[PDB]
Amino acid sequence: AQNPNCNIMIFHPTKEEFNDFDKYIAYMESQGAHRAGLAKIIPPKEWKARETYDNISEILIATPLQQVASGRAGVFTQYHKKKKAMTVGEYRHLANSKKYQTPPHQNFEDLERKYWKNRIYNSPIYGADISGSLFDENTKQWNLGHLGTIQDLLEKECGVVIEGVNTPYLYFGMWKTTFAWHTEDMDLYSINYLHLGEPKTWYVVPPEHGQRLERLARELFPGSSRGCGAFLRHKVALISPTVLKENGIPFNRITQEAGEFMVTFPYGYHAGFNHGFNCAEAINFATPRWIDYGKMASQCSCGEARVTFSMDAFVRILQPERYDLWK
Numbered sequence: 001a002q003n004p005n006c007n008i009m010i011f012h013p014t015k016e017e018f019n020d021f022d023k024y025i026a027y028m029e030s031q032g033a034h035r036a037g038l039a040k041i042i043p044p045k046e047w048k049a050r051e052t053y054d055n056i057s058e059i060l061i062a063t064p065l066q067q068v069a070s071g072r073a074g075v076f077t078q079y080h081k082k083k084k085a086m087t088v089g090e091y092r093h094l095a096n097s098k099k100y101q102t103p104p105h106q107n108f109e110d111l112e113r114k115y116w117k118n119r120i121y122n123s124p125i126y127g128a129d130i131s132g133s134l135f136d137e138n139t140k141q142w143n144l145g146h147l148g149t150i151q152d153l154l155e156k157e158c159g160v161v162i163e164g165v166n167t168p169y170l171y172f173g174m175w176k177t178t179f180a181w182h183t184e185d186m187d188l189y190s191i192n193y194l195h196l197g198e199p200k201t202w203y204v205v206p207p208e209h210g211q212r213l214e215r216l217a218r219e220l221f222p223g224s225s226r227g228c229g230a231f232l233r234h235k236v237a238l239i240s241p242t243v244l245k246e247n248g249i250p251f252n253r254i255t256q257e258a259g260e261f262m263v264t265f266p267y268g269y270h271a272g273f274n275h276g277f278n279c280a281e282a283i284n285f286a287t288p289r290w291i292d293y294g295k296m297a298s299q300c301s302c303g304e305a306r307v308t309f310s311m312d313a314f315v316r317i318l319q320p321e322r323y324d325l326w327k
């Protein structure tokens with residue numbers, strides 16, 4: 001078996017290899033990349049997402065989110081408080097202010113130490129899930145707005161014809177802005193491109209050990225576990241690498257820099273944080289190997305998590321018993 005220790009793999013495709021997206025995902029998996037839950041792809045040196053990031057300051061963040069923490073340094077939850085709308089220009093100025101800017105630090109490891117020591121004592125502002133794209137329409141390779149759709153993948157594999165669409169989202173971050181422990185909706189893949197700015201650090205549990213993370217989460221958040229059988233779908237829980245180690249949970253970490261892609265694989269739990277002002281773009285996608293994960297995916301049983309219009313049809317076709325129970 002390839003990659004048996006489930007290490008995060010890094011790939012350097014040539015411009016020739018960068019032409020066929022589906023074929024290169026299949027290649028990475030032939031080398032065992034999916035066993036880690038996450039892979040990094042560095043684009044060929046001739047490639048670019050767009051010519052310049054001039055004038056991105058005109059984009060609107062209609063509902064910025066203030067991320068307020070509760071708990072202890074290594075085990076906490078965060079709730080999102082809605083703030084008034086601001087432009088990306090206003091947001092970037094706020095991220096660079098004395099109150100919110102990245103602190104002095106020696107290297108990535110020093111800044112990671114400062115994040116986990118001090119995260120809970122601050123409330124950074126996150127611009128998340130903004131429908132849109134920053135890829136140039138003339139960019140033909142790995143353009144996250146020109147991928148084949150999950151609906152067409154299901155039709156090709158299973159003959160199923162369903163409603164729904166599939167478009168990218170933008171994320172504007174600052175120091176300490178946080179994404180909580182989660183897998184994707186319906187345990188889909190995701191692909192994430194860091195367009196501009198400071199790095200993003202990622203943590204990931206191998207898919208073959210995801211149930212170990214779930215068992216620890218039930219022990220650390222017991223009231224949340226009693227209220228919903230799939231509460232990590234709420235995307236509000238954080239657990240530090242020190243606590244994961246103390247409890248024997250297998251995981252890996254890596255830092256993504258501007259100009260790099262990250263792919264998460266079906267049922268790969270991940271979490272992380274931003275180092276400073278940045279802008280990323282992400283979308284979910286599917287392959288033939290995803291279908292069986294879609295059939296087995298857990299669902300939030302209490303109403304807190306959002307189920308989109310498109311996700312409704314996935315549940316209706318792949319999980320008809322759960323759909324009928326919803327009625």
Ligand SMILES: O=C(O)c1ccnc(NCCCO)c1
Nearest residue numbers: 171178179180192235236280
């Ligand atoms: O912010 C990101 O770059 C990012 C990366 C991967 N998954 C995410 N899911 C949203 C969870 C919100 O707590 C967000």
Ligand SMILES: [Cl-]
Nearest residue numbers: 103114115118
């Ligand atoms: Cl700090």
Ligand code: NI
Nearest residue numbers: 183184190270
């Ligand atoms: Ni994600």
Ligand SMILES: [Zn+2]
Nearest residue numbers: 228300301302
């Ligand atoms: Zn729930």
